[PDB]
Design a protein around this ligand. Structure first.
Ligand code: GTP
Ligand code: GTP
Ligand code: GDP
Ligand code: GDP
Ligand code: MG
Ligand code: MG
Lengths: 426, 428, 18, 426, 428
């Protein structure tokens, strides 16, 4: 029936994407050895959205993992739930991208794309009718933002009508790792605005903020941040594998979140999220699920949404929960801070219910929100990128490998016209 | 899989090859025989039945130290044909080490370069060590780098230079050999690291508290620098740093490829008994100008960028908290054209303590590689030194009659003045 | 392996008390 | 139904209100882990007027524990019933206000008030509509008075149609601990004489002499003091938790007892206060309840009501009593010592019946009443304030924190308008 | 985490801090090795497995008092890099300690202070002890006061200074060393407590009944004074008033920040055998004008601030009952602008006994911080001594031939003249 094929590029996208398969395998009862356990019909009537039968009773992932380095490929394989993936779906790289967009996109990124475009199309055509492709990567380094988005371009010209989700870790604004930050950020996005149906904006230090105070973790590791993202991933695709009173697929999101094909940038956050002590105190209910979500602190992006205005959004609730206060709480918030919503849209963010809660929970909600308040995020990358081009920084790793400064000014123009396009809707 | 091939030219290169590879054997766990009681493939070979030989070369023109290596303990660790030895030295002459007494050993050295680099594909590059103030250290190290440039072009040649100190030279013809090494070093080096001996003299006096050690105790700290810098190739980490990572993030223009390093904590057993080695405490100690290991004070120099990289049980939350507080402090300042100037790497495996060595068992460590514009003074102090030498024909009667002409000295003066103009315009 | 660990957060998003 | 939102100003407010939740938890019969015990519907039918359901079967308090130094929240969480308060309901500062009106209010207390406003709107907008607020804080201290009165300020512009009710502990003349009293005292009084609805005065030296002369207890701590506040401060809100023959909320006594908005400073008493050696010796009738009640040694203030005259007074009776011995003895005190009451209000008293008495007692009463005799309290603050501005000392923290002398002169002149307004009615 | 950093200068400040940290380590239960068999973090840095190091620095210009701390019982407790000492002692010379020799040690001090204070945010203030009667105590002690002003701006500066007591002084040039130090620390210390030696000698004579007592007997009493003053940060109490609370209640003007200390009961166990210690009794013995710790009788002065530290099993009622009786008695007098005159804090932990030391185990204790205008006459006698010694140009070339000129001497006299006149103007 419906199928989702996973694409993971970069070691950031492979670590935060392996956890996606670890929570999906947990949700559907699959063991790390590929054997179902948990004797429920409703955990298993919809497996084909993420798994294929492999003539041994093993439900194997429909995931293609690509990298230009093998040091992170064998760490995924040797980890727990890491033997679940088929070894052929691993795409090894020998040379490696040294956090350069040019080499990940032109020289040896294309030398690897002829061996990753065939493996994504073996998985794609094997089903009767594929629903969409999802991509999970980051724009910090080179092999994720240069070759993951080049696979994005190739699958667009092959399968245009299919939906094109991506989950990009933008580089953190004020705490800057990956010292060539704005080149791998801006040179990917102007090539990504014409080849992506949905883009979901997540930032690293926003995940650091929510681990610091709301979750109260004394030692937040990378594996902690990967599971904040991963719990937000399952809420977007709950109705794809589970029935509900009011279903909502990925293309149901795309039609109600973007009014124009040029903007497809969203904001993802997950609820409920409390500390160990606070979980024993908190009341899990439909009112005390929603004002946590309509909050800048819950947001997994380091751009404050209170500074701008919500254009459209969405909420996908999960669990055994009623449908009136789905909308009465959805519109009481639309009536109290009415200055926060754009005035020319009806009931600006939509509603969805999925009958199955996340495992352990009884109530949850995810949120995909297209807001104009991501402009301070794009502008902070903008003035740092122009600060690079006042005195022509780090150009020789980009000029001698097959491009020029005309594509640099093309990156500036195709990003600043989204800045002005966003500026005229408030 | 992957491999890196070390070069050790000069007497400083030989005994830094004795120190660096002592720590490499004492980290991976290989006896001086060459046996054990896949992460070790980056430096060692797979020879015979469980024997592992180093992927380095030892080049020197004088046998009084390199035969002294193959007579001592590690004589059955290295290959017998590995240590290439000359018959007579250069004796602080760039002229002989590059032209006359040098040419007959470079063909034998590059003989073992290609014979040891053709083992497996995945070679990140070469890792050469030299004494700039020395004669065969800069002499052979000159024409070894043109021959590697014309053979293996795109390969990442990372080069540790033990630069001579301002008032510590132990030589008189230092300004003549250092200028002619500089003329060879700009157009043939991808990554350069500065090692002024008097700064490692002082960071063992005030930080290790040992007041009268020898040259080999300096070689402990330099071996800890490489055993940091290259162990991210070998073991698992939160953010792996490759050899190819360094030249893609530390060089802004191909002429400014001179970077300067530091380490923390250079702490003995009796100061590790008392201070917690938190990530904030270990980072600002690495940026303390006394801990800098090339005596180039960065208070009046503008940092271009920098690449911290950590070892041990370091949590990345404390990495981002420590990297933020050294952003917000005012005593450090950046060039305004590079606002994002920090790169971080994390390795999990803690540094092993060498017995006998002055360092303690450290639970987490930091190696740092920075590029700045403070490198203007480390050459400008040498410019007045060399112009004052060259005014009235000091020691030039050796250099003229040993192969080269007058005019190479002036062309080596013009391109160091070119990097004087090049460093100031970056810092405008 | 050690790059990725969900052992505190795994219990933080289950409603279980020790 | 309705809920009263509690806030906990200062380290004194944290200690005096944590033992308010000693008697609310005891009367409603709850475990320190939050499990109800007692098996009667008179408690938990009206349980949401102070608690919230926690979807764990337990009840979490709607109180905002609040201080600028983290020492006292450790003390109130380590004692009995410390497993009651939610850790998210605690807000803490890392510096600590050194009993300073200046930095407690404008510079060092302002950076917390944005998050305290987040957590008080957290539990107010969560319900349908709350009833009011109760605010136990300190005027001797600088953190209870500094940023607690900022809380009092910003909630009036947030919910102006609501009601607030404050129990503020005042400075004391005889034992003048916290030597900087009147800066924190008369400038908070300056703030809340317009910006507060209803004020009760609590005096620690008054609680000393009541424990001397009606309890004969040889060595009380601040806990025994906080009990005597707590029993009366639960008795003023008996009707919102328990039914009765004649019902009255705190808005009833708000409208009844102030004839003018500029005068809303009152006094509490409590009865019966009987020694353990006098417990078997004491009859318990409504005669002995009210003939002990109108006595200065029973008052919770060090201001003598015989010097002034009552303006409008009320009484919250609790327990099972005859209606008309409530009535004819509120009239009997009006007819015997009639010189002590104002002449232009007929039947200056008011009373209410809450049919449930506090546990261990079969009836009780809590008096809230206006007095002109509160004038000597404010004048005692006044002549200390003007004798110390006559040498301009102690000012350099106040004028150095960024604030001016012109609001000090406004503070004197406004409360001098209050002492003159009280001067008219006797 | 909240902490306090201690500074000590001079041999007097070192010997004070030796017994002070002897008592602090005793009550927190840690041994001389630094390991106990989380309320200790205000004084001790948790470094390693169960090992703690003090947050204090010892300063001298002569190692003759520091090197036996490095070779004493508390050898591995104090980490040696906080015990830094010079080579030549200033020798009763402000000019030497502030202009000649203090330069090459102050930058080593600030490197340790920044390293030790930046490890943990939420630090409260600097508890600095000194002696103004000696050359390196006054010289380096003053020089650290300007630098900690310009480096740490807002933070509180606690000061206990060993002012030269009137008759016993064991020097001859204490007028020059004292008036020059107090000329500058007026605008560089937030709160300053007098400690005179004769006052502690008289207490040791008649209260503890020792006829021939030594300096470390005085150090035990000063240690108990500071332990009760900082017991509010370390131990939970009914009225927790911090060390930020002390100045904010007791210094009326920025210039008036000089005050006095006292302690009670200074009782040994053959008199605690007999004398029951009521809370009212120990607070009238603390207010007995003979028991002052700065030889300043307050009968001819007027109080304008007062702070009580009660610790032990002290009921808050007996604080109230005792302060009522000391208000009513006319033998003490309060100034007319300060009718309220008391800050009271209670701590639950009972005080310290040291076996081998002469103090006894008591169930409740009083510590005093007391601002009075009677400090006008203890500076009036310093006016008399310095005017006699400056009238005949005496001892002048040991101050003008080293790096400071004539003119600081006149400006120190005019500073004390304006400070003197400001005091009785407050009193009227
Ligand atoms: N850091 C470091 N520097 C060294 C070491 N050995 C020698 N040097 C430096 O090298 C300079 C002289 O060069 P050498 O390495 O001793 O001699 P060489 O390279 O064989 O060249 P010749 O002088 O001609 O023999 C000295 O001034 C030292 O500063 C060493 O082990 N470590
Ligand atoms: N109470 C007390 N006073 C001390 C102690 N040690 C020294 N003093 C006093 O300090 C005064 C002079 O200061 P010193 O410590 O001797 O010397 P300094 O302050 O370090 O400066 P220099 O004289 O230059 O060494 C003397 O008059 C002593 O009375 C001590 O252990 N306790
Ligand atoms: N959320 C998350 N971010 C990561 C992870 N690993 C690396 N990153 C981030 O990725 C950024 C650098 O990009 P990187 O992954 O190193 O190179 P790339 O894969 O080619 O884009 C850094 O800012 C890291 O914080 C991970 O497991 N999770
Ligand atoms: N009734 C009562 N009064 C207290 C308590 N704690 C402190 N106080 C009073 O509050 C005053 C001290 O102010 P404090 O709360 O310590 O200062 P703050 O921390 O700035 O609010 C004194 O007059 C005490 O009598 C308590 O637990 N109960
Ligand atoms: Mg040589
Ligand atoms: Mg001295």
């Amino acid at each position: 029936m419906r199928e989702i094929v996973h694409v993971q590029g970069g070691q950031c996208g492979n670590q935060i994407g392996a956890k996606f398969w670890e929570v999906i395998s947990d949700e559907h009862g699959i063991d790390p050895t590929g054997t179902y356990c948990g004797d429920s019909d409703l955990q298993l009537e919809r497996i084909n959205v993420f798994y294929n039968e492999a003539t041994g009773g093993r439900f194997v992932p429909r995931a293609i993992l690509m990298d230009l380095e093998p040091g992170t490929m064998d760490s995924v394989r040797a980890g727990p739930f890491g033997q679940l993936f088929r070894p052929d779906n691993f795409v090894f790289g020998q040379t490696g991208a040294g956090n350069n967009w040019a080499k990940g996109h032109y020289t040896e990124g294309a030398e690897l794309i002829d061996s990753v475009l065939d493996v994504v199309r073996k998985e794609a055509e094997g089903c009767d009718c594929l629903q969409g492709f999802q991509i999970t990567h980051s724009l910090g380094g080179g092999t994720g933002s240069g070759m993951g988005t080049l696979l994005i371009s190739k699958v667009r010209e092959e399968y245009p009508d299919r939906i094109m989700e991506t989950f990009s870790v933008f580089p953190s604004p004020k705490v800057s790792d990956t010292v060539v930050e704005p080149y791998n950020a801006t040179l990917s996005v102007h090539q990504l605005v014409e080849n992506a149906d949905e883009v979901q904006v997540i930032d690293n230090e926003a995940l650091y903020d929510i681990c610091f105070r709301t979750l109260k973790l004394t030692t937040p590791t990378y594996g902690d941040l990967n599971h904040l993202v991963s719990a937000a991933m399952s809420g977007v695709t709950c109705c794809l594998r589970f029935p509900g009173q009011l279903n909502s697929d990925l293309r149901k999101l795309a039609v109600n979140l973007i009014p124009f094909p040029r903007l497809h940038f969203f904001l993802i956050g997950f609820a409920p999220l409390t500390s160990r002590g606070s979980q024993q105190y908190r009341a899990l209910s439909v009112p005390e699920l929603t004002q946590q979500m309509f909050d800048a602190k819950n947001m997994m992006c380091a751009s404050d949404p209170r500074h701008g205005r919500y254009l459209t959004a969405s909420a996908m609730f999960r669990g055994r929960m009623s449908t009136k206060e789905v909308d009465e709480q959805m519109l009481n918030v639309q009536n109290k801070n009415s200055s926060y919503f754009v005035e020319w849209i009806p009931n600006n963010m939509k509603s969805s219910v999925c009958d199955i809660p996340p495992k352990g929970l009884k109530m949850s909600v995810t949120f995909v929100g297209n807001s104009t308040a991501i402009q301070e995020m794009f502008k902070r990358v903008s003035d740092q990128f122009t600060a690079m081009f006042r005195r022509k920084a780090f150009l020789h790793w980009y000029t001698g490998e097959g491009m020029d400064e005309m594509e640099f000014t093309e990156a500036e123009s195709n990003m600043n016209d989204l800045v002005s396009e966003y500026q005229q809707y408030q | 899989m992957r491999e890196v091939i070390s070069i050790h030219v000069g007497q400083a290169g030989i005994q830094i090859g004795n120190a660096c590879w002592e720590l490499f054997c004492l980290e991976h766990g290989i006896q001086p025989d060459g046996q054990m009681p896949d992460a070790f493939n980056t430096f060692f070979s797979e020879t015979g039945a469980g024997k592992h030989v180093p992927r380095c070369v030892f080049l020197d023109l004088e046998p009084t130290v390199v035969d002294e290596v193959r007579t001592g303990t590690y004589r059955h660790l290295f290959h017998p044909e590995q240590l290439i030895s000359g018959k007579e030295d250069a004796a602080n002459n760039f002229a002989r080490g590059h032209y006359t007494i040098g040419k007959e050993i470079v063909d034998l050295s590059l003989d073992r370069i290609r014979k040891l680099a053709d083992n497996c594909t995945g070679l990140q590059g070469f890792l050469m060590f030299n004494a700039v103030g020395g004669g065969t250290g800069s002499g052979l190290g000159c024409l070894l780098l043109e021959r590697l440039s014309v053979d293996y072009g795109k390969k990442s040649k990372l080069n540790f230079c033990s630069w001579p100190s301002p008032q510590v030279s132990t030589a008189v013809v230092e300004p003549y050999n250092s200028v002619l090494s500089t003329h060879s070093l700009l157009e043939h080096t991808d990554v350069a690291v500065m090692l002024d001996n008097e700064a490692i003299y002082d960071i063992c006096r005030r930080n290790l508290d040992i007041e009268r050690p020898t040259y080999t105790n300096l070689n402990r700290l330099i071996a800890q620098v490489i055993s940091s810098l290259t162990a991210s190739l070998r073991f698992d980490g939160a953010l792996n740093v490759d050899v190819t990572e360094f030249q893609t993030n530390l060089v802004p223009y191909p002429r400014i490829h001179f970077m300067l390093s530091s380490y923390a904590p250079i702490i003995s057993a009796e100061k590790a008994y008392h201070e917690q080695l938190s990530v904030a405490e270990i980072t600002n100690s690495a940026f303390e100008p006394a801990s800098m290991m090339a005596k180039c004070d960065p208070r009046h120099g503008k940092y271009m960028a920098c690449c911290l990289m950590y070892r041990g049980d370091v949590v990345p939350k404390d990495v981002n908290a420590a990297v933020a507080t050294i952003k917000t402090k005012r005593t450090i300042q950046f060039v305004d054209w590079c606002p994002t100037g920090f790169k971080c790497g994390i390795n999990y495996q803690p540094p092993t303590v060498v017995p006998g060595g002055d360092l303690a068992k450290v639970m987490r460590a930091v190696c740092m590689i920075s590029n700045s514009t403070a490198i203007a003074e480390v050459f400008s102090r040498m410019d007045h030194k060399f112009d004052l030498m060259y005014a009235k024909r000091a020691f030039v009667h050796w250099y003229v009659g040993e192969g080269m002409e007058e005019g190479e000295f002036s062309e080596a003066r013009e391109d160091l003045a070119a990097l004087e103009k090049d460093y100031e315009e970056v810092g405008i | 392996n050690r790059r990725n660990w969900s052992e505190n957060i795994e219990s933080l998003l289950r409603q279980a008390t020790p």
